[PDB]
Every structure is written in C-alpha cells, then in structure tokens.
Design a protein around this nucleic acid. Sequence first.
RNA 1: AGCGAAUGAUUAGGGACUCGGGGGCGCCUUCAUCCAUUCUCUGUAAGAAGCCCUUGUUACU
RNA 2: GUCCUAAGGGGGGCUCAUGGAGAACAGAAAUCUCCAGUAGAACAAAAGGGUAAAAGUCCCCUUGAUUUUGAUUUUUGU
RNA 3: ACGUACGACCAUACCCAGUGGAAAGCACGGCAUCCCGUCCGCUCUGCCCUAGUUAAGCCACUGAGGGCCCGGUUAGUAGUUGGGUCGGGACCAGCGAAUCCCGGGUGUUGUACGU
Lengths: 298, 36, 156, 168, 141, 59
Amino acid sequence: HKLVKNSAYYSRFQTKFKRRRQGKTDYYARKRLITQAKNKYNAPKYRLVVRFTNRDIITQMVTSEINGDKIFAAAYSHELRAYGINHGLTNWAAAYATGLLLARRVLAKLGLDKTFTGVEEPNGEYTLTEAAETEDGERRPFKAILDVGLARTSTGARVFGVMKGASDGGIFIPHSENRFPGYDIETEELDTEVLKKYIYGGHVAEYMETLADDDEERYKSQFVKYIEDDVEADSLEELYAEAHKQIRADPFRKYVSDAPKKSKEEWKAESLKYKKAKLSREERKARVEAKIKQLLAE
Amino acid sequence: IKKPKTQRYPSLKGTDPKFRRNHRHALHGTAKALKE
Amino acid sequence: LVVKIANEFVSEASAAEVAAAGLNAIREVAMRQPLCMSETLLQDLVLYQKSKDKGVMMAAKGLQSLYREVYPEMLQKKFRGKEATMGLRAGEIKPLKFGEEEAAEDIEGIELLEKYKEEQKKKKVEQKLATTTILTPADLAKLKELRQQAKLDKML
Amino acid sequence: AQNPMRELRIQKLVLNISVGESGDRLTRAAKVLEQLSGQTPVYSKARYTVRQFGIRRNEKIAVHVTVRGPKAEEILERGLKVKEYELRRRNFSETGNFGFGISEHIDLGIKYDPSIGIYGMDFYCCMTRPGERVAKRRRCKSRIGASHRITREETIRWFKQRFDGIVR
Amino acid sequence: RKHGQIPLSTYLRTYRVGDIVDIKVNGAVQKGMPHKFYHGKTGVVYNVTKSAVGVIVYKRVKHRYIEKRINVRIEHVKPSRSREDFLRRVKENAELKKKAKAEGVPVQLKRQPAMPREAHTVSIADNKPVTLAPVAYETTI
Amino acid sequence: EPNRKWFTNTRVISQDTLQSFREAMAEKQKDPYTVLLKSNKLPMSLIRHQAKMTIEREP
RNA sequence: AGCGAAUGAUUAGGGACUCGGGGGCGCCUUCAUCCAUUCUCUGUAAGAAGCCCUUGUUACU
RNA sequence: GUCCUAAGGGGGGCUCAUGGAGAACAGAAAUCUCCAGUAGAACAAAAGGGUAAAAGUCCCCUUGAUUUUGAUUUUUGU
RNA sequence: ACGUACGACCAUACCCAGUGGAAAGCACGGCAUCCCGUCCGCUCUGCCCUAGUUAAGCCACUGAGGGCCCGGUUAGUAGUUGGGUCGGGACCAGCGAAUCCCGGGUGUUGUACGU
C-alpha cells in the first residue's frame, strides 16, 4: 500500500538535463571534449562529431561557444550517391568515404586544401598527418578530436572508419591503431591487408560471394538492390576508388535528393496546414463550463 | 582603516613560470628594439 | 572446527560480541594454520569488515591482513591491497602448501653481497662467493644491510 | 489492435535449478541444464547467510540458463507437455509473463543417467511485443507505452490460443 | 544551484589578467576551492593557468588590510558586472563625446542623480478625485 | 536528557517470592538474637473509618 | 558534541531441557537455564596611471 | 602482550536501498523474471555537505602512493 | 513551420492517462560471413534500406490530473532605523517582506543539412 509517487516525491524530484533525459548527450565526456586550457584563450577546439543512423551517417566539424555549438563543416553519407556510392551508405567503406569528404570540405573551407593533402592512395597503414614543407616554413596540420557519442568503442567500429577517412583526408586526428578492424590483441600488430579490405569494402564483397555460393535465397533477400543495379563483388573496389578520386577532385558536389521539392515558404505553409492548434482561453473556459455542467448533472 | 597603496608595476612572483619566462625574453627583445 | 565456529558464532542471528569472538578465534587459528580455510568461506568472513560493529570490523580486517601477508590468492582483488597485487602480478608471491619447507641452495642476500663485491672491485679497477670466498663477519653485516635495503625497495 | 507489430512473442525462457548446496549436486544440475539448453549455464551464489538453510554467502547454491529463439519455444512446449497443458491462473504475472515448475527432468524426454540423478526445474517465460529495443537500447532509451504493454488477460488468451492450454 | 550536472558554459568563459571576478564556491566539485572566508568576495585576476585563475583579494586584519593571492578554479569563479556599468558608460560617453564634438553642441558628460521634478498640469477629466475618510466606510460596515 | 529507562519498572518481584520473603523475615523478627547480614542491600521496604462512615451516612 | 528498533521491555500458558545446578530413589525430578512467543519507531566599481587605433618582441600559444 | 587505525590512477560496462506481481521442494527468509524506484543504497560523520551512462559496483591494464624548484592559503620555520 | 545532428538555459521541459501525425527524416525492423561481445546476436558490434508498421519511441493536442513556473493581492501589513521632558503602545522622519488566497499558463532558442 506504499505510494512512492506522491506529491512530496514530485516536489522533491530534480530532473536531469534535457539531452540526457532524451539519452542523446554524455556530458561527462562532453566536458572533457569541449574544455580548452584558459592560458590558450579563444582557441577553438574542433571536434569531429560522428553519429550513426539506420540509413545515414552524420559527420560534422563542431566548435563550442557559450550559447551553442557551431557547425564549421558537415558531410552526410547520402551525398555519396553523387560521387557514385548509391549502395550501402552505412557500411565501413561509406563511413571512410564520408570522413574523407568531410576532411576535404573542411580543408577547402580553411584554405589549407593544397598545403595539406593526405595519403592519396589508401594503403591501410597507421599514419598520421604531420607538418608540411611550406615555403614560409613548417605548417602544423589541422587538428580535430573525434566524438563518437554513445557508441561502444570496440575493435572494428565505423566511428574509427570516419576517423581514418579524416586522417587520410588531412586532418591531424590523434589516434591509435588498436581499434582498427585488422588489429589482433594477442599479437599487438595491425593487419594492413585486412584494413585495406575494409577501406575498399571487401568484407561486403566476400559476404555476397559466400551467400551466392551457399544460400541464394538469403542473398536475394538481403542484397537485392545490388542485383537490381548490377553492381558485383569485384567492382566494389573500383567503385570506391573512383568515389575517392571524385571526392578529392570536387568536394562540393550538389546532390538532388529525389524527394518532393518546394521552397521554405511553401513547406512552412504546408506544415501550418497540417498543424493542430491549442484551444483559446475562451474555448478552454467553455469546455470547463461544460465539464462543470456534467458534474452538476452527475 | 585606510586602503593600502598599490604599485603601478607589480612584482611577477606568483605568476605562471612559463609565462614569466616568455615575458622576460619578450621584455629583452623589445628592450633591444628600443635601443635600436 | 573452523566451519563449526563460523556457523555457531558468525551468523545473522548471532550477537555482535559473539561474532567478534568467533572471528577473533578464527583469526588465531588461521595464523597458526592458514590452510584450514576454503576460499569462499574466507571471502565471506572478510566481507564482515563492512559490519557496523567495531569489534567485528577489526576482527575481519585482522583476518584479511593476515591472509594478505600469508596467502593473498584467496582474497578478492578488491581486498588484496597494493603489495599483494604487485607481488601476484610480478610473480614473487608463491602459493603456501602443506609440508612445504624452504630449500634455499644459496644464502639470503648472497647475490646482493656478490653484487656489492663486484661493485667494489669495479671501483678499485677504475681507481660463487659461498663456494670459494670466506664469509667475513663484516661481509655478513654488509649482506644483511643490503638485504634490508632490498626489502625496503621492494616494499616501496 | 490488429496491427501486426502488436503480436505477442516470447522474449526469453529462463530455466532455474536452486539446489541449496554446493559441490557435485550443483555440478550435475549444471550438466543437466547444459545438455538441455545447449549453452553453458551460469552459477548463482548466496547473497546472504541463512543458518536454517545451511547456506552461506559467496557459496554457490543455484544454476540457471536463459534461452531465446525457437529453442525457447521448443523447451517451453516440452515443459508444457509435462504440465499437461494446464496452468493455474496465479501463474500469470501482472506484467504479462508466466511460469511453472516441474519436479523431474526426465519427463522432458531426457534419459535417466544414474550418476546424474533427478532434479526439478523452474520454467519462466518472459513475453514481449516488437518494440522492446526502445526500452533496451543504450542511446535514446525510453519507456514502452501503456497501449503496448502486455496485460495478464492478453497473456492468458495468447496461451490458450497457441498452446491450447487450460488456465483454471 | 540544483544537484546533479554542472552547466557546461562555466568552462567556456575566457579569462584574462585584470578582469574583475567574484568567488562563488561550487559545492559539487571539491578540487580547487578557496578557504571558507574568501567566498562571495570579488577581486582581480593576476594569473591565469590551464584550469584555474589567480585572484587578488584584500583581507582585513586588525587595523590594516593585507593583500592575498588565491588560486581558484574556473568552476568557482564568475565574471562580475561591477565594471559593466563602467565599460558601457565609457564606450557610450566616448562615442557621444565624439559625435558632440563633430556636431558642435556640447552635451551632458557626467551622470546626474535624481533631480526634483518640474511643473506639469494634471487634468481631472474622467479622473475625478474620490473623497477618503480616515477609516473606510465599507470597513465600518 | 530524555531516556526510555525513566518510564520502566525498576524493581519487580513475584507473588510467591514476596510471600516467602515476608514469612522468612517475620520468622527472623521472632528471634531477637538473630540479625541480618548486609541489611542495606536487602529489600526491607517490602517488609516495612467508622467516624467517616457515620458522617457519610448522616451529616 | 551527544541520543538512536544499532533502543527499552515482556516471557503466565509452550517446548528444548539434564548434568545447567541441585534433590530424592542408572532412574525420575525441583528450581533454574535458555529458546520459541510477543510489546515498543559584508565584497567590488564609478577613468588622464583611463579608452581607442597603429606598430613591434617572444623560447608562450 | 596479540588485533584495527583503511588501496590509489586511467578507461569501459551497469544501476542501488526498497515495494508490487510471479516460479517444484521454497515457506517470513535460498535462486530466477518483469514493472515501479531522485538516491531514501554505497563512498571509513550512524540522522553534515556532494555524487547516477558516477565520486557507487564489476571488468582490463597499472602503481601520479615517483623525483626537482619556487608561489599561495590556513598565519621565522614547519 | 516540420524533421535530423550537436547544443545553450535545465520540469512552463517532469510523472500519469487518452487522441492524431501530409512530405521527408526518425524509430521499430531483417540477416549473424567478416570486426566484436555475451549463459543467451537480450545489450554491443558487423551486414541490409529490400518488405512490413506508425503498434511503441518521437512530435502535437487534450486533463476542473499530481507537480513546476509566472503575475496580482496579502500590504505600505509584519518587521526594522533614528526623535520627543510622548503615554502608562501611539505619533514624527523614513525603509520595507513572505505566506494564506485570486488567478493564469504547461517551453524559448543558436549553428548546419534537409522536408
């Protein structure tokens, strides 16, 4: 007969933050991510926010201000259809391509696009961008810190695929090789060939080969759009290489999303048409009087 | 109780040693800059 | 005997004084012979240090400390402490066994004494011991001092 | 109400054997659970010392195994065949789960090994609806709605429809 | 201040030497607190470090004041609006004096306290005065 | 200071024990040559209307 | 700083009782042992040493 | 005379006390399952302050529980 | 205006019930070869975006809901600072609350990409 949820409990209840009640922000990690040394003053601390959705990847340059965060640059996985990748936009190779695209976009916006060019041919080796031989002198590489959010940082996660994409694009992201999908904990040596296979999406290719050999029905159920648009297991490496070359060529391509298209005012008018509105004070008082009449009848 | 007097240029004693080390070299550099 | 003392003396219905007396007796028996325990029983008895009674707390902490010097493997990783975990990680601490006696082929600190003699010889040049060299009493005192210094370094 | 993602399904089936004593009896009970489920069972220690039960803290006194998928349906069907497809109405919880208990594990179809012995079991079937990942996931964890929560009556009707059982 | 998470804009304030800041001790974090006294006091930043600032306070002892230098973390300090009314005034007065010198007509350069009010006319149309007794007649009822 | 032991009985004794003690102590007073030992520690406190009716019936 | 259901009591009726003690003739006992029961929650600011622009120095960033 | 005067650091995962409803023996109390649960648990202050993707608990590596020099507070040296 | 990502104030945002959701985005979802972690692919991780569904999350609306927040009053009242050769508390000069009640509400907003 205990009533835990009473008026005293509701009055003494102290809510969490809104983005923690929604379960979207880890403020304990976010504090360490956004604090800058006070002797460094107004030096921005750029972070690569990476988030993974069921059908998309969201990769951003984020800076922190006292009243909000600013997006310096942003690249999404669905924009790779303009570069060629129109299948598997949430896999490890698409994560790498999105990270490379974001790195090229932020370097082009900063203007260091020609001074800092990363590794142009992906090899799968643990490398970090260093100081470039500028004619003026030594230019330190542009630095950003990875922010994975609430993702479990296990070995083989695509949060490190986007990391490797930015590191190959030219951003100095401090990182270690032990969470790449070729690392062995016992040996403590990274497998460059397996990492390159994940770069060019060869794990998906050998998956379709294995499925086509053993279980044709499951292959047709899962990889149906690959069959429909006639992309094979052997063509994935060339497709991703051409996509990387096109990304390094034109980082600011525009993609038509094939969704219904209107203007901001037209979408505003449509959303106001499909919008139930709150009752006025007079209407609320009228329904309160109706409830009072019902109570008097009762 | 009168307020104590203050110095226009306070002594850099409790300041961060790294900033003090850089600041003294900056003072020497601007010193030869003024001597030039 | 230890199981009977644990059941009759250290139980949920037992008084605090009865539990403290039983744990003290168990600690005495464990000092005299440590192999009487089971690991689960010892961890259960060490968990009585969280008791609100001071006597039960100090008796359980005495039992835990005794097994820290004697046999830290039965103790939980939370309860081992610093030196026990470092010794178990490095491998110096060995399991205690019934009937096991020391079988040191060389004297304790003889390696340190030989190292000190080699350092003195190297200093003289710049300016096996048990088999051939006669054990001087000054050399034995120096070896004891070196063993004490090595024990202090291992403790640090 | 008839929406095909409101259909009831078995979230899990948990098999429990609380021996009350450690050693060979618990080892053979774990052997029974392992050969039944196909998975390695997990042991459960006592959390406080009870003198009248002959148990103490940290001493292992129980064993259990959680099985999901069609294997859970098969094991539940065998247990219900032992229980002659008949349950008493108290066995259904207010949260939509149910459970029962058998006294001999040889009624499940397991052979009698004389070294192993005879042990009884507790079967607990936890039900769910599609959309429990909302309450089980790490990022954006939320609560299941009242219209989506399973009711004791719905569990009883689902049992009577699928397993043609008699709840009385 | 509620229990739980510290707001994160405390870490995003940029601190320089010479700034005027006050000390509000945050009970949640124990590292970097000043003494019990020097809480709620306002002083001048003389040293800025990676995660803390040095504040000059003037304590009183007997019949004199002693300068004190304290190292307090950024989590317990807050910018003080004591000189906000001076900085806004100096910027406003500087630009106003520049505009007045450009135009030719001199303006008021000093803030003036509350002067007595001037003469004005109050009309009794639609605001006819009501007569009040020392005690309200409704109250007497 | 408030305490629970202010509101408890401090000395209790049973019927048979009190009766036996009184009978034995009376037998001890019967002899004038027998005196108690440690009498200060003994419970010796246990050992140690016609006009009104007429006035009530007739004032 | 101290108090504390981490407390203060109750135990008639029920047992275990047996050498706990003791008595009588190994056997019963008479007390007594306990257990089972229960009750009690005051700081700072209000400028010419101040503000703004330009310009260097640095091993700091 | 014996015994106690307390294991810290980094990272990761998970929520505690308790209540309701259920499962052969199993009941007031053994293990298992769901829901509710702002801390009512735990952290070596028994009713002080502070902590919930942690400052609690568990797991993996570790001894920043290391040398050296000034400054500040409690106020000549500590 | 509506979503998504990162956010600032951190209940006007929380908790309990119902009702609805164009477009896209979400989400539930499907499959365990590889990376990875479990008593259990439950969680985590990998692959699919095809199918199904707005059932739940999420958003919006509703409630003489609990709570929370903001105004009037309470009240120039309580209280407090000085004055009198004032009485046996009231005046003079001034500062000046919060309850109780009467009501209202039930989130604003930055950056970037889209519908």
